[PDB]
Design a protein around this motif. Structure first.
Motif, short mmCIF file in Angstrom:
data_model
loop_
_atom_site.label_atom_id
_atom_site.label_comp_id
_atom_site.label_asym_id
_atom_site.label_seq_id
_atom_site.Cartn_x
_atom_site.Cartn_y
_atom_site.Cartn_z
N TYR A 6 0.80 -1.20 0.00
CA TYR A 6 0.00 0.00 0.00
C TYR A 6 0.82 1.24 0.00
O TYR A 6 2.02 1.19 0.25
CB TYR A 6 -0.86 0.01 1.25
CG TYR A 6 -0.05 -0.15 2.56
CD1 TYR A 6 0.16 0.94 3.42
CD2 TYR A 6 0.48 -1.36 2.92
CE1 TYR A 6 0.86 0.79 4.61
CE2 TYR A 6 1.21 -1.52 4.12
CZ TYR A 6 1.41 -0.47 4.93
OH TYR A 6 2.15 -0.67 6.16
N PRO A 23 -2.73 8.68 0.23
CA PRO A 23 -3.67 8.35 -0.85
C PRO A 23 -3.00 8.65 -2.18
O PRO A 23 -2.49 9.75 -2.35
CB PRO A 23 -4.85 9.31 -0.61
CG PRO A 23 -4.82 9.56 0.85
CD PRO A 23 -3.35 9.55 1.25
N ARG A 49 -4.34 0.53 -5.39
CA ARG A 49 -4.37 1.86 -4.70
C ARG A 49 -5.59 2.06 -3.79
O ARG A 49 -5.68 3.10 -3.09
CB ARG A 49 -4.25 3.03 -5.69
CG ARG A 49 -5.52 3.33 -6.51
CD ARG A 49 -5.26 4.53 -7.41
NE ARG A 49 -4.14 4.28 -8.27
CZ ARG A 49 -3.47 5.23 -8.92
NH1 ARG A 49 -3.81 6.48 -8.78
NH2 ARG A 49 -2.45 4.91 -9.69
N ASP A 50 -6.55 1.14 -3.82
CA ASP A 50 -7.64 1.21 -2.87
C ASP A 50 -7.61 0.04 -1.87
O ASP A 50 -8.69 -0.39 -1.38
CB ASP A 50 -8.98 1.24 -3.49
CG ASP A 50 -10.07 1.65 -2.45
OD1 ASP A 50 -9.76 2.57 -1.64
OD2 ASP A 50 -11.21 1.05 -2.42
N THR A 88 -15.16 3.83 0.33
CA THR A 88 -15.05 3.65 -1.09
C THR A 88 -16.03 2.55 -1.52
O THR A 88 -16.53 1.76 -0.67
CB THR A 88 -13.64 3.26 -1.50
OG1 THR A 88 -13.52 3.33 -2.92
CG2 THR A 88 -13.33 1.87 -1.04
N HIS A 99 -16.97 -0.28 -4.82
CA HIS A 99 -16.60 -0.90 -6.07
C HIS A 99 -17.66 -1.88 -6.48
O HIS A 99 -18.08 -2.71 -5.69
CB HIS A 99 -15.28 -1.64 -5.96
CG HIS A 99 -14.13 -0.76 -5.66
ND1 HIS A 99 -13.48 -0.79 -4.45
CD2 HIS A 99 -13.53 0.21 -6.39
CE1 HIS A 99 -12.50 0.11 -4.46
NE2 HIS A 99 -12.51 0.72 -5.63
N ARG A 128 -15.80 -0.28 1.27
CA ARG A 128 -14.58 -0.33 2.07
C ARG A 128 -14.48 0.93 2.93
O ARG A 128 -14.55 2.08 2.43
CB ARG A 128 -13.34 -0.53 1.16
CG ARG A 128 -12.01 -0.52 1.94
CD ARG A 128 -10.84 -0.93 1.10
NE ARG A 128 -10.90 -2.33 0.72
CZ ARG A 128 -11.12 -2.77 -0.52
NH1 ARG A 128 -11.26 -1.92 -1.53
NH2 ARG A 128 -11.17 -4.08 -0.76
N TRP A 160 -12.42 3.14 5.53
CA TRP A 160 -11.04 3.47 5.79
C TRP A 160 -10.81 4.33 7.01
O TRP A 160 -11.58 5.28 7.28
CB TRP A 160 -10.45 4.26 4.58
CG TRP A 160 -10.16 3.51 3.38
CD1 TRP A 160 -11.01 3.25 2.32
CD2 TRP A 160 -8.93 2.93 3.05
NE1 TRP A 160 -10.35 2.54 1.38
CE2 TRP A 160 -9.07 2.32 1.81
CE3 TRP A 160 -7.71 2.84 3.70
CZ2 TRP A 160 -8.04 1.63 1.20
CZ3 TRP A 160 -6.68 2.16 3.06
CH2 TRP A 160 -6.86 1.57 1.85
N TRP A 211 -8.41 -0.77 7.28
CA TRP A 211 -9.69 -0.77 6.61
C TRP A 211 -10.48 -2.05 6.86
O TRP A 211 -9.93 -3.09 7.27
CB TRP A 211 -9.58 -0.51 5.10
CG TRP A 211 -8.76 -1.50 4.25
CD1 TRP A 211 -7.50 -1.29 3.80
CD2 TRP A 211 -9.18 -2.73 3.71
NE1 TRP A 211 -7.10 -2.33 3.03
CE2 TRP A 211 -8.11 -3.23 2.95
CE3 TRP A 211 -10.37 -3.50 3.79
CZ2 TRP A 211 -8.17 -4.45 2.28
CZ3 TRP A 211 -10.44 -4.69 3.14
CH2 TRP A 211 -9.35 -5.18 2.39
#
Lengths: 100, 10, 276
Positions: A11, A15, A98-99, C190, C192, C202, C204, C244
């Motif tokens: 990671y 961000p 990246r997430d 987030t 998806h 998700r 965080w 997360w």
């Protein structure tokens, strides 16, 4: 002789923003014994300028280490962490999302 | 600081 | 709140490859402040935090001498343990030691620790009364009798209840800007789409300190663990931590889910919900 396979997370420190300098991290934890090989990859080639933390361990005696390198993410470039350890019959490669 | 006592071989 | 000082030591034998690898690291709470590594050029205890650098040459010479003494005792232990368990010379073995102390909000002694492991397993440990030992097996019982005869528990009790807490208070004051801070998590969610039938949310938590934190998911206000994924809290590299938690939900039911975040820096637990 206790053998524990490592958990691996790949990671960024901040961000990700394409074109902006950041740090790419590979965190390996929960493993035993301590000998481990960790490499950060860019488009399948090992990155040389990688640093790591000082080996320490958790309440269950399992080891952890952070490997990191300065980098600037782009939309096209692929990054991953390659890890080898005695519990792995084959090196594990974890791609950077990246997430995640 | 590290311990200067109580650290002995097993 | 409560605080702690902990030292961690690892020694690894190297069959047919010489002296054992030796690594020592020191922490105040979740912050590392010193290290010693036998593979390093320095062969000295070294600073890893801004606030410990102010310590004079008397400090660094003394810690270096003591850490080298811990290294030499582990070196002997590796040889002793190989004998105790009648292990061959071809294998690599590990010794680990950890000790330290906790203080309460008033900065007074709460508890002390000293534990030892061989090959990833408990070997011997000091009990919470700091007066007696727990031995894992018959080999460790040999060590327990040696340590009772040398009054090792009484020595450690004096160190943990005195020196340890006095130095921890000192570090907490010198590193106040760093150590007495609480960074609340920056949070976001987030989404998806995985399929026309399921999606993932998700939650965080970023840039938080200390590392302790709790992330939980609810569906219509009910705790949910099924179909959830939680990753281990991880270091950012800049002194803070990240974490997360995710859940796979039926498509179109995203708003039925809420993520809850507890942390010492949060007066109230935070509640997040997917908002496009």
């Amino acid at each position: 002789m206790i053998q524990r396979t490592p958990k691996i997370q790949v990671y960024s420190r901040h961000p990700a923003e394409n074109g902006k300098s950041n740090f790419l991290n590979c965190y390996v934890s929960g493993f035993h014994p301590s000998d481990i090989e960790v490499d950060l990859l860019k488009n399948g080639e090992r990155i040389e300028k990688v640093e790591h933390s000082d080996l320490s361990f958790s309440k269950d005696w399992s080891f952890y280490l952070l490997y990191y390198t300065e980098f600037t993410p782009t939309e096209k470039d692929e990054y991953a962490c390659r890890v080898n350890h005695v519990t792995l019959s084959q090196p594990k490669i974890v791609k950077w999302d990246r997430d995640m | 600081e590290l311990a200067a006592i109580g650290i002995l071989t097993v | 709140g409560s605080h702690s000082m902990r030292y961690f030591f690892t020694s690894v034998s190297r069959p047919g490859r010489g002296e054992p690898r030796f690594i020592a690291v020191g922490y105040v709470d979740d912050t590392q402040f010193v290290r010693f590594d036998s593979d390093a050029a320095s062969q000295r205890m070294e600073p890893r935090a801004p606030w410990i650098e102010q310590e004079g040459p008397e400090y660094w010479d003394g810690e270096t001498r003591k850490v080298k003494a811990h290294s030499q005792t582990h070196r002997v232990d590796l040889g002793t343990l190989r004998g105790y368990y009648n292990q061959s010379e071809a294998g690599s073995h590990t010794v680990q030691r950890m000790y330290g102390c906790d203080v309460g909000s008033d900065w007074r002694f709460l508890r002390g620790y000293h534990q030892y492991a061989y090959d990833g397993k408990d070997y011997i440990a000091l009990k919470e009364d700091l007066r007696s030992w727990t031995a894992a097996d018959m080999a460790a019982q040999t060590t327990k009798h040696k340590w009772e005869a040398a009054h090792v528990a009484e020595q450690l009790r004096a160190y943990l209840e005195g020196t340890c807490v006095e130095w921890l208070r000192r570090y907490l004051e010198n590193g106040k800007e760093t150590l007495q801070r609480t960074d609340a998590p920056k949070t976001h969610m987030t989404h998806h789409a995985v399929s026309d039938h399921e999606a993932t949310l998700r939650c965080w938590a970023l840039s938080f300190y200390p590392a302790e934190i709790t992330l939980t998911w609810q569906r219509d206000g009910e705790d949910q663990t099924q179909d959830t994924e939680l990753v281990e809290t991880r270091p950012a590299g800049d002194g803070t931590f990240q974490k997360w938690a995710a859940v796979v939900v039926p498509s179109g039911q995203e708003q039925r889910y809420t993520c809850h975040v507890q942390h010492e820096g949060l007066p109230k637990p935070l509640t997040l919900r997917w908002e496009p």
